[PDB]
Design a protein around this ligand. Structure first.
Ligand SMILES: CC(=O)[C@@H](O)[C@H](O)COP(=O)(O)O
Ligand SMILES: CC(=O)[C@@H](O)[C@H](O)COP(=O)(O)O
Ligand SMILES: O=P(O)(O)OC[C@H](O)CO
Ligand SMILES: O=P(O)(O)OC[C@H](O)CO
Ligand SMILES: O=P(O)(O)OC[C@H](O)CO
Ligand SMILES: O=P(O)(O)OC[C@H](O)CO
Ligand SMILES: O=P(O)(O)OC[C@H](O)CO
Ligand SMILES: O=P(O)(O)OC[C@H](O)CO
Ligand SMILES: O=P(O)(O)OC[C@H](O)CO
Ligand SMILES: O=P(O)(O)OC[C@H](O)CO
Lengths: 242, 242, 242, 242, 242, 242, 242, 242
């Protein structure tokens, strides 16, 4: 069916938090996005609450007209929050307290029991889990074995390719990994580093269910405003599939 | 004459730097702003290059169609940069390496010789100096004594007033300080924390020459886009004087 | 000095409640307005929770960037809710469960004790109280005697005049009542029934502090969108003072 | 040819009637919709004239540039009005005087004679009849037998689905029902509860002739303006079919 | 009192009647105009019904949110229609069945009895009457003597001026004539031939109450759309008064 | 080959000529149209010069960026004008001095010699000739026999259809007639009476080369502006072909 | 009355001529400017037809809705063209065949007879003459003596000011010159080098009748579009006078 | 697969250089385009630095977000500049100092040695080389033999065709040349003379990788603004492939 767009509004809070003011408010960015092409909203509640905060999640949970996709690290604090919050989607990601952003898929194959616990735990609460991982068969077989219904392939390496050949190489690895994951019964998403200029190649991949894009959109938004930024990204996505 | 607007684009870089990507690029934000009501562009080259970087200043110096107002801490590194860069305006501000943002006027009365050196030094290079200070007579007499041709009153306390009375109190102190400074031959600017809802009271103050606003504009921009954000702030300013 | 605009978003909620869906959400309408010329947001908590709900007030209170003006009846339930909510402003209004929409002004001259307590009570909680009253000297004197900081003159009869002469009649009545109110040291607002075609005459009255407008704005909004609706109204208001 | 959009403007009037003012006028909204993607305009003349009025239907009938689709209960009052008004389309729904909105499908199977004479009478007047019903084979077979050329499948349950699973089930139920209705020679529409986020899966169903949508469009319009609200909906609809 | 704008939509019907179609419909044009700066809608029912028809007048009378200004010739047909329609305003003009447009200027001084009975009759029906005349003090004194509360100075000669000097002369003529009219207690309007480039000089005349403009606006409209055309005219009008 | 759009700006002049002014100028309308989706500009020089004049034709011939399609009657006057103007295209139509608009359909089969000499003459001047005819295979066979490279099926009956059935019948008629025409080597255009709501069915006909639309577009234009009106039509046309 | 804006569209043509294509057409730009704040259109027919052509002047003369202001050198070629073209205004400038742009003012004082006969000849043709000169009392006195009704002060040096001090000096020089010219009965315009950032101080000068601006407006238009470019300039101009 | 758009901003600079001011600045034009549908920016460094300057290339290289396509002559100066600049793409073009704008295609078949070296040289520097050539098999074979990755077919003759037949002639010639080029393993682009009215036929050619367009876009831009100019072109291109 229709490829979907998950808009990550973390960086609205990044701008807010830089100053300690109330604006810009993620809650406003969520309404705009949801009416301009976003099929869902994503927020990464970082342990260090760098950008998205507890009030953000709490108020958003009440105001989203679509659904929340809560991104989080695998810890007891977070699992308890997710269970209490009951987001529709949950994407487990690797975290370091002071990293710039995310860059290593989640190491599922290496923490199989931790993840297995997380997946069972969140599902019991009625949350659909997605594991943020690398276009790596080892990590994918592990996500499947562990029970997760969704995986989201890290498109970072593709987005940072330094040459056209290097980019084609990564693209191919993502497409193969997508087909591979699907053959194991997993639904697959993608995201991170996706921009207005490299999104179509990823959107074209058939197995892709939803693309989670954040930074590039907010980066376009300061110039053109969120509404147009979201609608334009969505248009590019639908074009890639037609 | 006409009240002027200095748009601070630091937070365009804040968003860029959060990810290490090239966008959003301050250079684009500068063209947009300069064509939507900004009479000048301001950038704060922080020692820790948190947001605005050396390439930013170097490229902006070549692309600004109006003029640069370089905000900086008083150090030999910065003075050498300013002298080499030759910005049209220079605003000396107090810096701590890891502060959220600025909150203490510059302590001129306490470093009279340092400032006296800075002012003479920059002026020799053909730079018009402004000292970012508090609506404090002691600091103002000091700025005058030291030679600076401009001062910029810190409107932070006013912007963070917690009650209507507390706000009226601060407003009054800023207006009195503005009149006081002018009586000593200083031209006076204002800025920091200025928003769409508290700018008119400051713009109304006759002695005000230019208002330097940043965060609130970028904060509005993510929603409506820079162009409208800048034009709207400028309109509110001109309305306050008519 | 500068005439302020208070936008009442009640009817965003009537549209929502007509169905029991979540949209259109008052919370979104607030951000749009505050960014299009509104200086404060107004919401009337009806006894029958006809439109604005407790939920709305609870979230609005945390999402507004300007300040809340809570219109309500003088009942123990509401006073308790107001004291608890701590809105910046509170406007006391007459209210019948099955009324179409506020009949006229509060009877202050006839319930000096009840009102005296309501005021003091709210004032103790840090709320600036406005008594919605008719352009009647007896009521104004009463309001002043009771200790309210503000009054809001009812513009309903003016908006309902069936002839140019009847309208002019009401106009002068409001204009005199306003000068009178001010002479007793009361700040004075006005509202109810103001439209894009009759606001300027009211806006031109010097003594007016803030105009509270809702229905006509939402009515323009379903055609043009809330943003231009709010901006147009504000524009018209400022021209009248010009 | 292409999927048609019937825009129900009932809620423009609920906004009007909430106050008794003349605005917003349904007549205006009609021109905007017809020029923004509406192929027809829909109005439900309720027993209690809650929103649309005899006045509205009387003027719309003379101003609509496309065609009127009159929704109404099967009562002598409505049939008489229908026969006299001669709208292009008439949609027969079940109605309780004080319901929030239409609840379910018309009970056709269990009221064959009532409906058989209703369709016949309206047809003698040259009106094309559509019976609003549940995605129910029994109700569908009956609709055909009583001679109606159109049926409109209630999409309400699909819209209210509490879980993705429930939703997919309702979807399948509607698609199967639509195929069955068509096999019987019926032309089929769908509507009630359709939004910007659930409209595509319904539009994708091949048998669908025209979709009738109201509340969701009006709820978007208060933010966005009716023009864009309608165009965005028509856009999503054609995309779904492409 | 702000200068008012009366928008004549006759030429919307000129376009419609040129083909026999039902569009463009003057009824839609009226809603757009009243919401873009028009304080009133003007229509000239012509004997030959070349543009505005009885239908238009009958529907507009029910859809106008502001008020109707019916332009007509002084004949039995028209007077009976006006009394039955009961427009807020009515402007009597010279009419010749085969004319391009109004030649300009009622001969009031040469027909005091006819014009006296017309005004009385229209005023008995509660219609404020405007006598369309030339910038001639004889016609003006006559207008006052016959009982009309309004007159509208014909701006056609000013508009068709062939030299800067002739224009200046007509401008000075309209101005002095307007001051004279006001001294007689007459409210003075103006119109016919006004354009985006010659309206300011007329708007600057203090005594002017309302300007009635039509063709120029419709001619701008086919290019830029009715909304911006009305708005632009009103904007130039208000600027001239400041 | 994409379906092309020929925009007839006759009615821009209808509005101009109604007053004698110089605006709105067909010349400006042509630039807007050619840049908003029009692949060619069409003008019908009428014997009574009711709208387009010799001036228009003479200036348009020098300002058109695409190409002119001159609609005219088959008379000596016109043929001489066309040969002198040398329009890229020329469409011959039935003409009666006092007609509302083109009645529809050249009698080619009843005047083979006249039409044969006309085509030759225009083709000698290098003008590609289009014979405006009815969806009649006799007229079509004749058109081919006389030597015309183009014909334009008259869509007026389809447009004025009074019932869904009559419309369908005319649609099927235009379609089969177009297939027949193409089999004779004729390029087939269509136009007259097409609107935003009936253009798709005609655009979907594969054999169609260019559609010539005028009035509907000008009627939309007075409301929304020429640009969006042309664009909207072209958009619906291309969607129909997909 | 109000400050007038003459928009010079020469550089629309430099873009055209750089390629020999027909676009962009000056004729189109003229309609856009005249409807966006231009009170007149200016063209400089250069000796080398670098941008504007005889063709342009010939068509503009027939399409301009306002008036043409022909800029040209004082040569037999240009005077003859001027006399024949009959533009409303003619501005006499100094010109070298291969200059980048006009360098300074016309040498009037030192060529009295040449200019005296030029003004006389153009005046016999009914053209209003303006002599482009430096803010020079000698050149100004001479301009008056040779009979020119207008002078246009070169704002070039003010525009090129290398320092704020230099700029203020030039400003003062122009304002004083303007006052002097007026005392001599001359009407005075100004232009060349005016931008969005230096236009206000010039517009503020009371004696200024019309400002002629070109390059700056066209430079903004390639980014922004001509419409907004012209409207923004007219906006800044009226603000300066208010 | 997905046709790419390369926007040539040369003529932004011609407009700038016509005066020697800093605006319009190519650097601003780049950001706008890259964000409106351009996939890469093209600039031609002329020997005479007619428009694009070394400054432009130096900054552009650091500000572009997509990638540079440097068009240049095959000279030691340019090769040195290219190797030093390291543009993503480089297109070799024939160039005469006083030419109006690139005459035709490079002569590769006649200078196989020179080109062989240029290619290898640039390739060693990491640049993908495109040989701008005529749709001539001899040249294509040559280009393939020499080792260039790409060729860019000259669309000038196609754009200049004076008859529909001549245009069609050129079309097929380009289409065959493209299939031919591809069969030799060459990637193929096209450009020069493409406009909004002739791009689709070229865009529809399967083998096309990227179309490089400049002048027509800047020409549309002075009217509508660069953003809509770029977007429109891209939109048209994508529809042709659709
Ligand atoms: C894993 C990923 O792709 C991102 O969603 C990451 O959570 C973004 O973090 P920031 O928003 O802090 O950049
Ligand atoms: C002193 C002041 O008002 C600001 O300009 C300060 O330099 C802003 O720093 P940030 O931009 O990092 O918030
Ligand atoms: O790199 P971003 O900003 O595209 O963020 C990605 C989404 O949240 C996916 O995890
Ligand atoms: O607080 P801001 O963001 O308004 O920043 C202020 C200006 O640079 C003034 O120093
Ligand atoms: O009449 P309304 O709808 O403008 O309501 C006004 C606000 O509640 C202020 O009283
Ligand atoms: O649910 P609604 O309000 O969208 O409207 C339903 C349509 O009129 C269909 O009957
Ligand atoms: O000359 P018009 O077309 O502008 O309109 C005239 C007004 O209606 C005056 O009555
Ligand atoms: O019927 P119209 O006004 O749309 O225009 C007809 C076209 O010009 C066909 O020739
Ligand atoms: O400097 P310019 O290009 O703005 O134009 C000058 C005006 O035409 C005045 O002469
Ligand atoms: O003809 P242009 O102006 O489209 O120029 C095209 C680019 O340089 C590509 O060759």
């Amino acid at each position: 069916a229709e490829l979907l767009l998950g808009v990550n509004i973390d960086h609205i809070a990044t701008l807010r938090n830089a100053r300690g003011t109330a604006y810009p408010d993620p809650v406003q960015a969520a309404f705009i996005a949801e009416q301009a092409g976003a099929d869902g909203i994503t927020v990464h509640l970082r342990e260090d609450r760098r950008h998205i905060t507890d009030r953000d999640v709490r108020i958003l949970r009440q105001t989203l007209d679509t659904r929340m996709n809560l991104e989080m690290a695998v810890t007891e604090e977070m699992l308890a929050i997710a269970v209490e919050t009951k987001p529709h989607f949950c994407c487990l990601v690797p975290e370091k307290r002071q990293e710039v952003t995310t860059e290593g898929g989640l190491d599922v194959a290496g923490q199989r029991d931790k993840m297995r616990d997380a997946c069972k735990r969140l599902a019991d609460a009625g949350i659909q889990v997605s594991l943020f991982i690398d276009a790596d068969e080892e990590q994918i077989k592990a996500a499947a074995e562990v029970g997760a219904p969704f995986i989201e392939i890290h498109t970072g390496c593709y987005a940072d390719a330094k040459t056209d050949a290097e980019q084609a190489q990564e693209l191919a690895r993502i497409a193969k990994a997508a087909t591979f994951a699907a053959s194991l019964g997993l639904k697959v998403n993608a995201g991170h580093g996706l921009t207005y200029h490299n999104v179509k190649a990823i959107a074209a991949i058939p197995e892709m269910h939803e693309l989670n894009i954040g930074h590039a959109i907010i980066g376009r938004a300061v110039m053109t405003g969120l509404k147009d930024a979201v609608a334009e990204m969505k248009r590019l996505m639908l074009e890639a599939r037609g």
